[PDB]
C-alpha cells in the first residue's frame, strides 16, 4: 500500500539516523555550568563520513554542503549533525573526532570489558549466554534474574524522592488488580504441588478466597514477599539475599559498544624477543596531582585514577608537555552511570624500553648493544 | 489539501485543528533503533556514511540470510532490520529476536577487532614496519595544547599577582 517514493525513503540512509539518545545521566541535585560544555561520557549523536572525492566539495549527504574551512584538511573526516536544518537555515554541526577517535584509541588497547565485582581477580566476559540475555518467561526464578542486565523497572535507591512518588502513583498503584492475578497463577501451583506426589505413589487460577489467604501469611516474612514483588515489577535485586546491585543496574549494555573482545588471555608474540609476559605499555597523562585530593591520569582519552603507588605527588611546571608516565591497563568496565572506568596499574620498566625499541626512542637498544 | 496521514489521527477529537498540516513519518524500526543505540552508545562513534551513491542499495538487502548484506556496512541498522524480520516472519518477540540478531552482531565485531592485532603482529614477523599509531599521535597533540595552556596560566598568574601589588597601598614608603 505504501507508495514507491515512500518505500525508498524508508530504506534511505538519512532515515536510518538514530534519534539522539539522552546524555549520560548526572546527579540531578547538583550544580552545572550554563554555557561551556566539555566532551560527554559517551556519544549521543552519529558520526558521519564521506569520500575524499566529495569532501573537497563539502558534500556529506546532508541538506546542504558544509563549509570547506571547518571540514577539510584533517586526516580523519568526522562530523556530528545536531540539526539538519535549524532556524538560521544552516546545518548546526560540529567535529566528531572527540568521540570518533576515542573509540579507535580504546580499541587499540585490545582489552575486553569485565563484569564489576567487589573486592583472586577472576574476570568474566560480558558476551556470554549465561548473563547476556534480555528475553525471559514466567518460569524465570529469582536465581536467574540475577544474571540479566536489562530490567524494565527502575532502581529504587537511585530514584530521587519525587521520582519515587510518581512511580508509585503511576505504575505501582494501577497494577493492583493485575498483581492479584499474578498470585492466582502462583497459587494454582500451590494447590498442585500438594499433588507433587499424588500420581507417583493445574486449576483454572481464579480464587478470591486464596489470594487473600497467602499475602496475610507473608507479613511475618517480608523478604519472600519483596522477591515476589520484584518479579512483577521487574526490579533489579538490591539486597544480597549479587550482580553488583550496590550501585545499581547498567542503563546500557555492559560493553556499551566500545569493544566486543571477550578475553585478553593472549601473548602478543614479539618479533625478536618472542612471546611477552605482559601487554605493551601505554603512555598516560597526569591531571590533578595528589597535592582536591587524589590523582587522575588520562589513559587513551579516558580519565582514570592514578595507579596504586613523584610526578603524581605535586605539579611541576618544569616538565615539557606535562608529566607523562608509562602504564599498563589491567581491567576495564562500564559504570552504572555509563562511564568507562579503567582499573589502571603502574607498568614495569623493561617493557617500556621494549616498546621504545620499535618506536626508536629507546636510547639504549636492548638487542646487540646490551652485553648483559 | 488533506496531507497524508502517517499515523492514525485521534478518533476522539471533536473539533481537531492542524488538518492541513503534514504529519510525522514514524516506522516500527524507530522504536528498535532507539532501544539498540541506547544499549550501545559507543556504536555511534563508528563513522557511518549517509551519502547515497545511486539510491539502489535496497535492491540487494535480503534480511533472511543474515546481518552481512551487499552495499551497506555492518551497523546497528543491520541489527534492527534483522531483528524486525525475525519479529515478523518467524513470529519472534521483540526481546527474543533482539537477542538473536544482537548476538550475531557481537561475533562479527569480535573478528574485526582480532584481525587488526593479528595482522600487525603477523606483518612484523616478516619485516613489516608501520607508521605512528593513533595513541602516540593523540598524545603529541595534547602536549602542544597543554603547553599553550601553560603559557596562558603563566601570563594570567603574573597579571593576578601584579594586580595584588597595585591593589595594596604602597603610595608612601617609610
Amino acid at each position: 500500500g505504501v507508495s514507491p517514493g515512500g518505500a525508498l525513503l524508508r530504506t534511505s540512509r538519512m532515515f536510518s539516523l538514530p534519534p539522539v539518545i539522552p546524555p549520560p545521566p548526572g546527579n540531578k541535585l547538583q550544580m552545572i555550568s550554563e554555557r561551556a560544555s566539555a566532551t560527554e561520557a559517551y556519544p549521543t549523536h552519529q558520526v558521519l563520513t564521506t569520500f575524499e572525492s566529495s569532501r573537497s566539495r563539502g558534500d556529506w549527504g546532508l541538506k546542504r554542503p558544509l563549509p570547506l574551512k571547518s571540514t577539510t584538511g584533517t586526516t580523519y573526516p568526522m562530523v556530528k549533525v545536531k540539526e539538519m536544518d535549524s532556524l538560521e537555515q544552516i546545518t548546526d554541526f560540529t567535529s566528531g573526532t572527540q568521540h570518533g577517535l576515542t573509540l579507535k584509541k580504546f580499541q587499540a588497547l585490545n582489552i575486553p570489558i569485565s563484569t564489576p565485582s567487589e573486592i583472586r581477580p577472576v574476570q568474566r566476559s560480558v558476551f556470554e549466554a549465561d548473563t547476556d540475555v534480555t528475553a525471559f518467561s514466567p518460569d524465570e526464578q529469582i536465581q536467574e534474574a540475577e544474571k540479566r542486565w536489562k530490567f524494565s523497572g527502575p532502581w529504587l535507591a537511585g530514584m530521587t524522592p519525587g521520582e519515587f512518588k510518581e512511580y508509585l502513583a503511576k505504575t505501582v498503584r494501577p497494577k493492583r488488580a493485575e498483581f492479584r492475578k499474578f498470585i492466582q497463577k502462583k497459587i494454582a501451583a500451590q494447590k498442585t504441588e500438594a499433588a507433587n506426589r499424588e500420581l507417583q505413589e493445574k486449576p483454572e487460577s481464579i480464587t478470591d478466597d486464596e489470594v487473600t489467604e497467602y499475602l496475610r501469611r507473608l507479613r511475618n516474612d517480608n523478604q519472600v514477599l519483596y522477591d515476589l514483588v520484584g518479579q512483577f515489577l521487574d526490579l533489579a535485586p538490591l539486597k544480597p539475599p549479587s550482580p553488583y546491585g550496590g550501585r545499581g543496574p547498567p542503563i546500557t549494555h555492559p560493553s556499551a559498544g566500545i569493544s566486543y573482545l571477550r578475553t585478553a588471555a593472549y601473548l602478543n608474540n614479539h618479533p625478536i624477543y618472542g612471546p611477552q609476559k605482559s601487554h605493551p605499555p601505554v603512555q598516560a597523562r597526569v591531571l590533578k596531582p595528589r597535592r582536591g585530593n587524589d590523582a587522575k591520569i588520562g589513559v587513551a582519552g579516558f580519565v582514570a585514577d592514578g595507579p596504586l603507588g613523584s610526578v603524581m605527588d605535586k605539579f611541576d611546571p618544569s616538565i615539557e608537555g606535562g608529566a607523562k608516565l608509562w602504564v599498563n591497563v589491567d581491567k576495564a568496565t562500564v559504570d552504572s552511570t555509563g562511564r568507562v572506568q579503567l582499573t589502571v596499574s603502574d607498568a614495569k620498566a623493561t617493557d617500556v624500553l621494549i616498546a621504545k625499541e620499535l618506536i626508536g626512542d629507546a636510547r639504549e637498544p636492548i638487542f646487540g648493544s646490551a652485553p648483559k | 489539501p488533506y496531507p497524508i496521514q502517517h499515523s492514525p489521527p485521534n478518533p476522539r477529537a471533536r473539533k481537531p485543528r492542524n488538518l492541513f498540516r503534514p504529519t510525522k513519518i514514524v516506522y516500527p524500526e524507530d522504536e528498535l533503533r532507539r532501544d539498540f543505540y541506547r544499549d550501545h552508545p559507543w556504536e555511534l562513534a563508528r563513522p557511518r556514511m549517509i551519502i547515497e551513491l545511486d539510491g539502489k542499495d535496497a535492491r540487494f538487502l535480503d534480511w533472511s540470510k543474515g546481518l552481512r548484506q551487499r552495499g551497506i556496512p555492518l551497523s546497528g541498522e543491520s541489527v534492527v532490520q534483522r531483528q524486525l524480520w525475525l519479529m515478523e516472519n518467524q513470529g519472534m518477540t521483540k526481546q527474543e529476536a533482539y537477542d538473536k540478531a544482537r548476538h550475531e552482531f557481537y561475533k562479527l565485531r569480535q573478528l574485526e577487532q582480532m584481525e587488526r592485532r593479528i595482522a600487525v603482529e603477523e606483518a612484523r614477523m616478516v619485516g613489516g614496519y608501520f607508521g605512528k599509531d593513533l595513541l602516540t599521535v593523540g598524545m603529541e597533540l595534547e602536549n602542544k595544547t597543554y603547553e599553550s595552556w601553560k603559557k596562558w596560566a603563566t601570563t594570567e598568574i603574573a597579571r593576578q599577582e601584579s594586580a595584588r601589588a597595585s591593589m595594596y597601598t604602597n603610595v608612601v614608603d617609610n
Partner: peptide, 21 residues
Amino acid sequence: VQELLQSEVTSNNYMRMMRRR
C-alpha cells in the same frame, strides 16, 4: 627548606587555573 614551600606556593597557583574537576 622554604625552597620547597616556595615551589608549592606556585603549584597551588597553577592548580587554581585548572578550572575543571
